[model samples]
Target: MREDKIAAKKKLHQDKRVHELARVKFMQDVVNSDTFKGQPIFDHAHTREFIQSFIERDDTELDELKKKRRSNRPPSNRQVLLQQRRDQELKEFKAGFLCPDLSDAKNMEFLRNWNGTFGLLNTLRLIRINDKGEQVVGGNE
Candidate 1:
């Protein structure tokens, strides 16, 4: 039953096609930005037109996919595979590009007490000094 649910979710994701459209839109935005930056004299009209076309195409594709899925039409095996691939790519993209940055702590106690309140009031405001006797925040004055 659990496996069946996983398969169903995969099929629905593919049928809906939101991930594919989002990926395309992100790339198109980058391409549009490139052209705008490279050719200052180039008309912004066509860029906007391309953007609109992609937007409409994505909207229609998504709506149709949803409509079919809503009527109880499940996605094919190929569609499920495509969804898996897209999901993997998205997961990797997030992990690589958007994951949190962590600090290299010197001590467990210091790391344990990484409070935002104290940092906001003392460290950021430069009311405290570190072991080096240097201001926690530089140039408090």
Candidate 2:
């Protein structure tokens, strides 16, 4: 299955007729977009009409290759992980103790003068100084 699919994929990507049309498509894409960066003088009124002709030609040529493209492919393992990592990220965004900024003015003064404010307010505003931290993965127990 992969062998035939791969061949179809390879052929559509590299076949001469489709490949040549692809270049024409690239050119029309550039031409169809914004013209002049500075003065807007490179393309005149008749030039737009001339370019308009190729737009249809490119459109028709591109339409033939469109169906030949690889589609309905399943997601890879990495693709699955990428989605879960992003989706589950917000769930644990505030799940742990935050790392304090070592460079901010307020953070620096808090460390320097060290009054020990909201240093550790968990079960109801406890200004804990020596938290004596321990590292442990808080996954499912």
Candidate 3:
């Protein structure tokens, strides 16, 4: 409990420092934009590059930026259509299930006897979405 309190205090201080730094950067950028228009900007690119170096250190930041971009950009018509079709298929597949408890021996045997390969594929195609938004098959094809 004591360690948690100390850690929380440390994080609060760290966050405040980061917030201040961001504020400074924001003001600096505002100043730089105005100065760059007419007069020769002093250490403009150099300072910007220096700040960018900190951004380059975190790989996850790039992922966050991509996520932000995706959020702002709505899905295409084709993508929406594809998702609707997938949803429909998923609903149909789910509706086909008889037993609530798949672990039941009878249920397992029924699946095995009813559709030899269908149940296996349904279990196999548990695909995961990758960082690039691509469907990565959970298991080997």
TM for every model, in the order presented, reads 0.24, 0.20, 0.21
Q: What is the lDDT of residue 15 in candidate 1?
A: 36
Write the candidate numbers in order of decreasing TM-score.
1, 3, 2
lDDT assessment of candidate 1: 0.36
Evaluated at residue 53, the lDDT of candidate 3 is 36
Q: For residues 1-141, what per-residue lDDT tens digits would candidate 3 score against the true structure?
A: 245544443443322333223423432344346643243222323333433333333434444545656688644554455456555533433333111122233433333333323334344312232222233443577
**Worst lDDT window (10 residues) for model 3?**
94-103
The top-ranked prediction according to TM-score is 1
Clash list (residue pairs), candidate 3: none
Q: Which lDDT tens digits does candidate 2 get at residues 20-131?
A: 2332333334434565222222222323233333334544544444534456444455444544544343233223222222223343233333323232212121121111
Model 1 lDDT, residue 31, Cα: 36
**Residue 112 in model 3: lDDT:** 33
The TM-score obtained by model 3 is 0.21
Residue 77: error of model 1 in Å? 2.2
lDDT by residue for model 1 (1-141), tens: 245534443443323244333433333344346653453222224423433343345445555656678778856664455556555544433333211111122221232233422332222211222222222333557
